[PDB]
Amino acid sequence: KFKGLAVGVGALLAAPPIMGLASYAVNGISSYLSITINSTTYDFAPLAQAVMVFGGIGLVAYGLHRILGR
Amino acid sequence: KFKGLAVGVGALLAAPPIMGLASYAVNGISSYLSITINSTTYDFAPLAQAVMVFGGIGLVAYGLHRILGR
Amino acid sequence: KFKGLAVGVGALLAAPPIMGLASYAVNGISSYLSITINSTTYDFAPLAQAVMVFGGIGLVAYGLHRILGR
Amino acid sequence: KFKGLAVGVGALLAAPPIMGLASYAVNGISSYLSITINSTTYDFAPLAQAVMVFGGIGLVAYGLHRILGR
Amino acid sequence: KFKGLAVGVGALLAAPPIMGLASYAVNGISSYLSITINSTTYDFAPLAQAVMVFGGIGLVAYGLHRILGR
Amino acid sequence: KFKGLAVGVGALLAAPPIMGLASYAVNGISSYLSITINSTTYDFAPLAQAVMVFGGIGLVAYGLHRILGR
Amino acid sequence: KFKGLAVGVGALLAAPPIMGLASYAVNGISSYLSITINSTTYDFAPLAQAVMVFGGIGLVAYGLHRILGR
Amino acid sequence: KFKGLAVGVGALLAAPPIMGLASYAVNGISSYLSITINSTTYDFAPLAQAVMVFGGIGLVAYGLHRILGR
Amino acid sequence: KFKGLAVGVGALLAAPPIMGLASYAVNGISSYLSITINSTTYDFAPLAQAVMVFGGIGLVAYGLHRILGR
Amino acid sequence: KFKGLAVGVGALLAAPPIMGLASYAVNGISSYLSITINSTTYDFAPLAQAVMVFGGIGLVAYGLHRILGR
Amino acid sequence: KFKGLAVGVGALLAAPPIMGLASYAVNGISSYLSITINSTTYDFAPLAQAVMVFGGIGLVAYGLHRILGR
């Protein structure tokens, strides 16, 4: 059972240095996520923000998940 | 029967050092779980909190579960 | 699991210097994306703009994606 | 049966001087396991830590394992 | 069994003077890993950084791996 | 195992004096990589630049690669 | 491995005095690459130009190539 | 049977004056087993150490081995 | 068996006065192992260094090797 | 075994007074290794330089090589 | 081994007074290497130049070559 167990543990241990990186990605990008037509520009910046947030909540699941079954 | 029995025992023995880790994950993440639009930010922090709590109650089941049948 | 894990990490790490380049491409092109018939010209410039923006939001997914399954 | 028996015994006898070494490896490495981007660095140090811990629990199995069947 | 056993041991013993070298390689290279177009340059430096980090975590596996089976 | 091990080590040791040379090649060439038609010339200079950058990231892999398997 | 290694190194070292020559060839030729029919002449001069440019980008590959495999 | 028997006996009798010598070799060498690049040197000294240790455990096998079959 | 046995012994006995010489060779050479193009020179000095180090670890094997089989 | 052994030793002993000579050859030649067409001359000088450098690294191999097998 | 060794040494020692001569030959000839048809003459002078340059690079090989094998 430890095969999955560690997979889970690792996934938990890896969540904060991944979500650390992840956020540096999304900030490094937010400048490049808005569509200017004339003068009025319209971002889709914080769409991609959410990508990260449910990715966040999601990883801490995967860990806790792979500890308890398929 | 001991094949499952130990699987259960292990799962109980492993519950507090897993929920130890787990919590360090969710705190290491709570900074990175909120979606700021203008100035007003809106977390989904404690959603992921719950992920852990029913994961908690859940593991102590799995242990006690694999001791008594499919 | 690290095989995919890194694939993900790399993909996140690579998102801002890719979206850096990408944007230099789309600006280097916007002059060459409009169809002049008589005198009235009609761009399709910012079509290609969007190409980049959902490409943007998309990469930060791929990273976070390859960390959690097929 | 002694063919496997000793394989097991050896594996047990070898567990503490292997996990002795192993740990010196993982400490000798933890300096070289973190990805600095600007100023903010983000380790994946203790991922590799776990590698050792379930490797640990795992070896003491292999010993006890090769004593009792395929 | 010692044939693999040592292969493993060696691999552990060799991990910190390899990851010592490895890092001197990646620093000796980071100057030569960025693509300047006009004035704005865009590195892919820390992509190659990660190459090393999962290489790191990976070696300490290989050691512990070749001790326990195919 | 040392047969591959050294191949790897060498490859790491050789990465910075190769990427040293490599860059002197690509600069010695960038003058000779642009196609002038009338007056307007159009380089493909920094295409060949990238050749080097993923060659870079690539070598530091090969080293770390030949240490761990086929 | 040095057999290929040097082949590569040489190829890099040889790229700028080859692309030096090469260009003197293509200029020495551009006078003799246009098909005059009546009065209107039509060159194919800069076709042969490109021959050199992708030859350029190509050599700096071959070098970096023969360092890393078949 | 004595043909192999003695081969074994000899091999046992020869193990401590061989491992006596062997160690004098590996110490006489450890000064000449480290790769200094700038100032930071990185040994591979104790790799070769292990060479001896599993050589050790190995000889005492060969003896006991050639007493009992192919 | 002594035919190989001595071959081994000799090889061990010969390792430190060979690696003594060897190193005097590689130092006597390191001045003559760097390729200067304009002003910037680029050594491949410590490539040849490694040649010696795995040669080192390798000899102490050959000795211990020729004591135990083909 | 000494037949090859000395061949090796000699080859090591001979490496620095050969690479001494060798370099005097390549300097005595570098004046006579460049192809001037009009006014612009283009050397292939440092091609031949490399000839020596991998010849260098190569000899110190041959020595260490002929000590350990075909 | 000295039979080839000297052949090599000699070949190195002989390279600069041969390439000394060689060049006096090719200059003594360059007047007599161009085909004049009407008034426009067309040399093949520097073809023969190259003959010497790769002859150059080539000799310094032969020396270093005959030191290390068939």
Residue numbers in the entry:
A (entry chain A), B (entry chain A), C (entry chain A), D (entry chain A), E (entry chain A), F (entry chain A), ...: 10 to 79
What does the paper say about this structure?
An excellent model for such studies is the non-enveloped bacilliform virus APBV1 infecting the archaeon Aeropyrum pernix that has the highest optimal growth temperature, 90 °C, among aerobic hyperthermophiles. The double-stranded, circular DNA genome of the virus (5.3 kbp) is among the smallest known dsDNA genomes. It encodes for the major capsid protein (MCP) VP1 (8.3 kDa) in addition to three minor capsid proteins VP2 (9.7 kDa), VP3 (11.2 kDa), and VP4 (21.4 kDa). To study the molecular basis of the extreme temperature resistance of APBV1, we have determined the three-dimensional structure of the purified APBV1 virion using electron cryomicroscopy (cryo-EM) to ~3-Å resolution.
Two-dimensional image classification of the segments and Fourier–Bessel analysis of power spectra calculated from 2D class averages revealed a defined helical symmetry (rise 6.10 Å, turn 16.55 degrees, 21.75 units per turn, pitch 133.7 Å), cyclic symmetry (C5), and the polar nature of the capsid structure. In the cryo-EM map, the fold of the VP1 glycoprotein and the density for most of the large amino acid side-chains were resolved, allowing us to build a VP1 atomic model de novo and refine it. VP1 is almost entirely α-helical, consisting of two long α-helices (α1, residues 5–42; α2, residues 53–77) linked by a type 1 beta hairpin (residues 43–52), and flexible termini (N-term, residues 1–4; C-term, 78–81). Two adjacent prolines (Pro25 and Pro26) mediate a kink in α1, which facilitated initial assignment of the sequence to the density. α2 is also curved at Gly66, but to lesser extent than α1. The arrangement of the VP1 subunits in the capsid resembles the blades of an impeller, with the small size of the VP1 protein, and more specifically the curvature of the VP1 α-helices α1 and α2, allowing very compact packing of subunits. Each VP1 subunit makes extensive hydrophobic contacts to six other neighboring VP1 subunits, resulting in a large interface area of 2916 Å2 (55.5% of the total solvent accessible area of the subunit). A large number of aliphatic residues pack closely with each other, with Leu14, Leu21, Ala24, Met28, Ala31, and Val35 of α1 packing against Met61, Leu68, Val69, Leu73, and Ile76 of α2 to form a very tight hydrophobic interface. Our analysis suggests that this interface contributes to APBV1 stability at high temperature. VP1 is glycosylated, and sequence analysis using NetNGlyc13 revealed an N-linked glycosylation sequon (46-NST-50) located at the tip of the loop region. Although the density map does not direct assignment of the VP1–DNA contacts, or an unambiguous determination of the DNA conformation, it suggests that the DNA follows the positively charged helical tracks formed by the VP1 residues Lys9 and Arg79 exposed on the inner surface of the helical capsid.
